[PDB]
């Protein structure tokens, strides 16, 4: 065949998004979890199966202890990551990696060891002709079809911010903020406890993740919505657990995403996500700032909450000069924007010479990641 296709995988924490390069959507999207039978089984003709990977672990949740292998964009456990990639290629996509070049995404300001060990596994585990590791935020920018913007990337791993102008990139102005979907989940199960609902274990920690994926929203003013929580009517929502227990969540619902704009609630000094965007834009040159204000791109899974775009617009407009208009461009489909940006990149004809070849790795070693790529 011509061009050989190519393979693209996004592994921020929480979800593997994977598929062929040259398509508009990934074939396989599943949770990045390795769930191990904690309870010793007593039957004959079970499994045994040392561990379960992917949405198999979601189905068989109650037995398992679940371990996310990626925390804060950092792989904690390498064998668990290899198992997840083994699951992507053989269980879903049914590809031999020898037949495809593979793009991986990776997060900004990330330890060198993750990029270098990630390449070491791609060549010396799944034999592969070529690969690339690319920055998450630039891929979302490509997916949005814009040449310029400040990309606010927040996954389940960590929050990142990369300003770009006309292509290029500003290394000093790149900001990484330790907040995530996962930290909002840990805050959320903590704020459910005051209501009497106690979720203590990994299995129902993913149940509050599912709650937060739909019920939670961001206030267009926090204090105003917290004041109208005195007359509870629309702010309460009934939620059904898989147990058949019913949960009723009021003001507790919208103050969980409020943590992004008030990290004093989590107990971290690190500024809210709108001030981090100001911190990135202020580090940029005076000239370009006009379009960075007007071309803010949201990406990732934890920018999906209803009303985030409006809240960021009101806060950035309030802080900034009202001399210029602050447009925020946050697409629906923004969850998959990194994977789509990886699809478009590996489909680019020129990019087919910028691959890290297997040959170039075999001569010059794993350290060449940083030398060739950003």
């Amino acid at each position: 065949e011509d061009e050989t296709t190519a393979l693209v995988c996004d592994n921020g924490s929480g979800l593997v998004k994977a598929g062929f390069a040259g398509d508009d959507a990934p074939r396989a999207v599943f949770p990045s979890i390795v769930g191990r039978p904690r309870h010793q089984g007593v039957m004959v003709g079970m499994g045994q199966k040392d561990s379960y990977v992917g949405d198999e672990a979601q189905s068989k949740r109650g037995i398992l202890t679940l371990k996310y292998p990626i925390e804060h964009g950092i792989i904690t456990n390498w064998d668990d990551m290899e198992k997840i990639w083994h699951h992507t290629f053989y269980n879903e996509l049914r590809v031999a990696p020898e037949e495809h070049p593979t793009l991986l995404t990776e997060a900004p300001l990330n330890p060198k060891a993750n990029r270098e060990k990630m390449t070491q596994i791609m060549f010396e585990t799944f034999n592969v002709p070529a690969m690339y590791v690319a920055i998450q935020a630039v891929l979302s920018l490509y997916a949005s079809g814009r040449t310029t913007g400040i990309v606010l990337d927040s996954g389940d791993g960590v929050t990142h911010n990369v300003p770009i102008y006309e292509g290029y990139a500003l290394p000093h102005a790149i900001m990484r903020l330790d907040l995530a979907g996962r930290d909002l989940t840990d805050y959320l199960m903590k704020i459910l406890t005051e209501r009497g609902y106690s979720f203590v274990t990994t299995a129902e920690r993913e149940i509050v993740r599912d709650i937060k994926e739909k019920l939670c929203y961001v206030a267009l003013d926090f204090e105003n919505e917290m004041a109208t929580a005195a007359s509870s009517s629309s702010l309460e929502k009934s939620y059904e657990l898989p147990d058949g227990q019913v949960i009723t969540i009021g003001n507790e619902r919208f103050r969980c995403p409020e943590t992004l704009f008030q990290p004093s609630f989590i107990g971290m000094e690190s500024a809210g996500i709108h001030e981090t965007t100001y911190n990135s834009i202020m580090k940029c040159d005076i000239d370009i700032r006009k379009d960075l204000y007007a071309n803010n791109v949201m990406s990732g899974g934890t920018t999906m909450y209803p009303g985030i775009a409006d809240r960021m617009q009101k806060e950035i407009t309030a802080l900034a000069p009202s001399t210029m208009k602050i447009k925020i461009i946050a697409p629906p489909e923004r969850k998959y924007s990194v994977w789509i940006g990886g699809s478009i990149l590996a489909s680019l004809s020129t990019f087919q010479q910028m691959w890290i070849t297997k040959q170039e790795y075999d001569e010059a070693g794993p350290s060449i990641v940083h030398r060739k790529c950003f």
Binding site: G22, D24, G145
Partner: protein, 1039 residues
């Protein structure tokens, strides 16, 4: 396959109205008939009838009869089910997958189904592997032999060779028409087909799955019989990448871990009809690890592999231990007493031995003890090769006691058990590649190289058998047991006082010459190896007097006389004054026998030693056979009837010394000859093999300059075989440029009035039609080497004044007569109508009458798309070379649009397009064609090949590629075909503004620019693609 033209001639002669549309619904009905005797006779009618339709013009109706036999798979008459699978073994399922892609109503058919009509996975999972799980022993055996006939014929989708189903049919018809360790295993680098290793690994995937996930006794039992018949036609050692599943993860040990767990159960060995096929297959899967592993059992060297070999060598000494206590009525390392699992195996070898000794029937292949004792001495042999002296040194006591009792029942393979122990007791690709470009370059590369003692009780018993037996399968394995006791120097004490055994081999030469001996053929190659090897200790004076009797006084040569000397010549020429006289004797005998092509392999050995021993003696001997064989090739005495026969004679003229071929006085009087009568295809076939093998010498061994100076002296008239001279045989100032060019264009004319106008089973054979259409395949490779390589200057200009010319009043095969024969070669032989496409281009004859029939310029016949897409990859590569003629550029783009794009992964049509990007006016005509053909460029594979061809075009024509990127192709619902036409339209705007503002405004008009932006605002297309909309607003305001 011309059902159109042939039916017209009959109807005006005999006025019946009978088409073949009125007989297939008469044949579709008797398949659905009630009685099970009526259904046996209608499914032999589809053995004859569905290999001829499916490659014909009626192959709409030909696919339907494949469908209905699939419903006949579950009828309960055991003769109805086994004549189904023979008409599902003779199917070519690479030609069958091609018709599915062309169908749109046939996928629906009755009741308007949605989905694909998957014939191949339904005829392989739900018949052939399914009929392995039948109850009858008759139905289980016939289904294995089809998986020997299905694996070369599968075409699973998207290999890394054949891509399309168009390219699949083209590679099985080009191999046809364009050209001591034990038996288990191999040590070669093993050159193998990459795509034939992929079809054999999907038939061993679904076969190890109805053996492990099966729930019946009948699925486990008759699928160990289908794995033993693969490994004797597709061996494991040669095709190891197909058999590989897991073990050692890289030369393989495939799937052998399941089958040992079948044998160690106490259920499965209790029936000898398929326990004897699970022992021949567990020795094929532990021997394919021998090219890897070899550097207890110290020679195995792989400790994950030793329990598989410890078990079978424990399993095969306990089954020669139950066959020793059965042939001798004795009550019950190798020991089966204390096992209760193998006391069940002693009551099953004793039921099949009470029916042999009571019922006298000697000539049975299937005996199930005589079939079972053949299986467990074949595989005790193949393991000892892996063993050493140290592992067997405690077992040379053991295995020799059992064979003295196991000698009388089957001594043919009880010495094959003894032949091996003494070894290891003494240490020892896109339809332009396939049709033309891969076979064209094996032609020109072999031309530049043409310019260049516990045995002492057991050994004495085997010699009394050879004097008294009569079966000649046993007489052949006893002459190899004695050629190993002389190499491994056992002293000549087998005959301690007398010469009893050597006197008996001399008498057997009396029965072969007269003919009083039944099967001398399978013993005469091995009689003569024993005799020459003893004389290094009957001497070589006496050995060569015996061979002279058989030849002149005895039977024919290709069984007796020619295999008689293969032991002598290899053991006399390869390996003082007494040795000089005996080499003159053996070379004189072969000159009486040059006529046979097996005698010409023995004589390539003779010429390679004289180049090593003494180069003065090397040139004397190549002159003596120069003036013998070239008088034979003109009088056609040389048996070149095979394609095994033309391969031996062309490696002879390379190795024959060029001093004996340097005068061209001899090679031309042997060339330009007429046979006696060309009535018979025994005699037409040996005259056209004398012209193909002396013409491999006039191209390599001598250039163009030497050849044509001679024919001015030798009056070789071009009326030698003319259309007046060729007609009376079938019933019964000339330039040297002009003499040699009428001889090679009227010899294309003899081979093409036969293959069209001769019957296929009347005048010729089918083995004689494998080699008659294969002499037209290597004579059109000789004509495209003379016209391309440029060393032959005078011969190229001579044909151009002849194909333009008419015949001499009808005295020659004129160029419009020769081309009517070839378009009825389209359908029977489609690989050889791609070689006639590349000659007519090469002579300056681009005549648009013949080039439209082959490309169809404005279901389908499966054997024309190899030629329709094959003559359009070859018509572009003629345009790309001399692109200065613009008359041929504007024809092929305006007419063939949907074909020009859909080939763009091919090396001759990839180069046709880049020159169009180079040319200013030729780029603008390519873009007018796609706007007419946007209605067909909507399928997802046809639109990915346009953007790689509309990628970079001329900058003067980037204003017509931006009105096509917006109006037509951007509204596709494919969101990576709306994303990849955003990369190509933003890039046209950026190179234009850094260019001149003068030439670009006349390119993209100011009135035409306002039409484009009204299309994007009423629709949502501007708000979808932001990058395209920003670049066009800055264009207007600067202008």
């Amino acid at each position: 396959f011309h059902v159109g033209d042939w039916m017209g001639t009959i109807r005006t002669l005999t006025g019946n109205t009978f088409s073949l549309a009125d007989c297939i619904p008469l044949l579709r009905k008797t398949l659905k008939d009630e009685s099970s005797v009526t259904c046996k006779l209608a499914c032999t009618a589809v053995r004859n009838c569905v290999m001829s339709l499916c490659s014909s013009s009626y192959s709409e109706l030909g696919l339907q009869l494949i469908i209905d036999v699939l419903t006949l798979r579950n009828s309960s008459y055991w003769l109805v089910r086994t004549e189904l699978l023979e008409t599902l073994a003779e199917i070519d399922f690479r030609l069958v997958s091609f018709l599915e892609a062309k169908a749109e109503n046939l996928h629906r058919g009755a009741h308007h189904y949605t989905g694909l009509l998957k014939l191949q996975e339904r005829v392989l999972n739900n018949v052939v592997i399914h009929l392995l799980g039948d109850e009858d022993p008759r139905v289980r055996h016939v289904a294995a032999a089809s998986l020997i006939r299905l694996v070369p014929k599968l075409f699973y989708k998207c290999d890394q060779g054949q891509a399309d189903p168009v390219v699949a049919v083209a590679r099985d018809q080009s191999s046809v028409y364009l050209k001591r360790i034990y038996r288990g295993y191999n040590l070669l680098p093993s050159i193998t087909d990459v795509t034939m290793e992929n079809n054999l690994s999907r038939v061993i995937a679904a076969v190890s799955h109805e053996l492990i996930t099966s729930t019946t006794r009948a699925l486990t039992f008759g699928c160990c019989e289908a794995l033993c018949l693969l490994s004797t036609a597709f061996p494991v050692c040669i095709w190891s990448l197909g058999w590989h599943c897991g073990v050692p993860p890289l030369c393989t040990v495939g799937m052998a871990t399941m089958i040992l767990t079948l044998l160690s159960s106490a259920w499965f060995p209790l029936d000898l009809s398929a326990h004897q096929d699970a022992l021949i297959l567990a020795g094929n899967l532990l021997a394919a690890s021998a090219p890897k592993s070899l550097r207890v059992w110290p020679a195995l060297g792989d400790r994950a592999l030793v329990p598989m070999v410890e078990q079978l060598f424990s399993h095969l000494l306990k089954v020669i231990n139950i066959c020793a206590h059965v042939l001798d009525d004795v009550a019950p390392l190798g020991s089966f007493y204390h096992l209760p699992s193998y006391l069940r195996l002693h009551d099953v070898l004793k039921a099949t031995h009470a029916n042999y000794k009571v019922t006298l029937d000697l000539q049975n292949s299937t005996e199930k003890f005589g079939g079972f004792l053949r299986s467990a001495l074949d595989v005790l042999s193949q393991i000892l090769e892996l063993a050493t002296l140290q592992d067997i040194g405690k077992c040379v006591e053991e295995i020799l006691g059992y064979l003295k009792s196991c000698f009388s029942r089957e001594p043919m393979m009880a010495t094959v058990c003894v032949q091996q122990l003494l070894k290891t007791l003494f240490g020892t690709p896109g339809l332009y590649h396939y049709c033309f470009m891969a076979p064209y370059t094996h032609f020109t590369q072999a031309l530049a190289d043409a310019s260049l003692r516990l045995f002492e009780p057991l050994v004495i018993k085997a010699l009394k058998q050879y004097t008294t037996t009569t079966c000649v399968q046993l007489q052949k394995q006893v002459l190899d047991l004695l050629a190993q006791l002389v190499q491994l120097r056992v002293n000549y004490c087998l005959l301690d006082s007398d010469q009893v055994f050597i006197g008996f081999v001399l008498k057997q030469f009396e029965y072969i010459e007269v003919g009083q001996f039944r099967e001398s053929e399978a013993i005469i190659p091995n009689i003569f190896f024993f005799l020459v090897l003893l004389s290094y200790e009957i001497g070589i004076p006496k050995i060569i007097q015996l061979c002279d009797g058989i030849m002149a006084s005895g039977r024919k040569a290709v069984t007796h006389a020619i295999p008689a000397l293969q032991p002598i010549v290899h053991d006399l020429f390869v390996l003082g004054k007494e040795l000089e006289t005996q080499k003159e004797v053996v070379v004189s005998m072969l000159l009486r026998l040059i006529q046979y092509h097996q005698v010409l392999e023995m004589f390539i050995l003779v010429l390679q030693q004289c180049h090593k021993e003494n180069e003065d003696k090397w040139k004397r001997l190549s002159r003596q056979i120069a003036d013998i064989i070239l008088p034979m090739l003109a009088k056609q005495q040389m048996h070149i009837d095979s394609h095994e026969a033309l391969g031996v004679l062309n490696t002879l003229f390379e190795i024959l010394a060029p001093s004996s071929l340097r005068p061209v006085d001899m090679l031309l009087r042997s060339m330009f000859v007429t046979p006696n009568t060309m009535a018979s295809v025994s005699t037409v076939q040996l005259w056209i093999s004398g012209i193909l093998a002396i013409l491999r010498v006039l191209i390599s061994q001598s250039t163009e300059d030497i050849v044509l100076s001679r024919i001015q002296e030798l009056s070789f008239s071009p009326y030698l075989i003319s259309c007046t001279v060729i007609n009376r045989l079938r019933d019964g100032k000339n330039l040297p440029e002009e003499t040699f060019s009428r001889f090679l264009l009227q010899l294309v004319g003899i081979l093409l009035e036969d293959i069209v106008t001769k019957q296929l089973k009347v005048e010729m054979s089918e083995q004689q039609h494998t080699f008659y259409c294969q002499e037209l395949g290597t004579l059109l490779m000789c004509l495209i080497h003379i016209f391309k390589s440029g060393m032959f200057r005078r011969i190229t200009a001579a044909a151009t004044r002849l194909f333009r010319s008419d015949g001499c009043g009808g005295s020659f095969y004129t160029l419009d007569s020769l081309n009517l024969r070839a378009r009825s070669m389209i359908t029977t032989h489609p690989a050889l109508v791609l070689l006639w496409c590349q000659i007519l281009l090469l002579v300056n004859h681009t005549d648009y009458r013949w080039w439209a029939e082959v490309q169809q310029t404005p279901l389908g016949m499966c054997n024309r798309e190899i030629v329709r897409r094959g003559a359009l990859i070859l018509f572009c590569d003629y345009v790309c070379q001399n692109l200065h003629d613009s008359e041929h550029l504007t024809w092929l783009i305006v007419n063939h649009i949907q074909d020009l794009i859909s080939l763009s992964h091919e090396p001759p049509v990839q180069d046709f397009i880049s020159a169009v990007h180079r040319n200013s006016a030729a780029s603008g005509l390519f873009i007018q064609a796609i706007q007419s053909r946007c209605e067909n460029l909507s399928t997802p594979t046809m639109l990915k090949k346009t953007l790689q061809c509309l990628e970079g075009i001329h900058l003067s024509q980037s204003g017509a590629v931006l009105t096509l990127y917006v109006d037509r192709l951007l509204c596709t619902p494919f969101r990576v075909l709306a994303r990849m036409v955003d990369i190509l339209a933003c890039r046209r705007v950026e190179m234009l503004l850094a260019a001149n503002l003068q030439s670009s405004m006349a390119q993209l008009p100011m009135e035409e620019l306002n039409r484009i932006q009204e299309y994007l605002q009423s629709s949502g297309l501007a708000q979808r693609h932001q990058r395209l909309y920003s670049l066009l607003d800055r264009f207007r305001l600067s202008t």
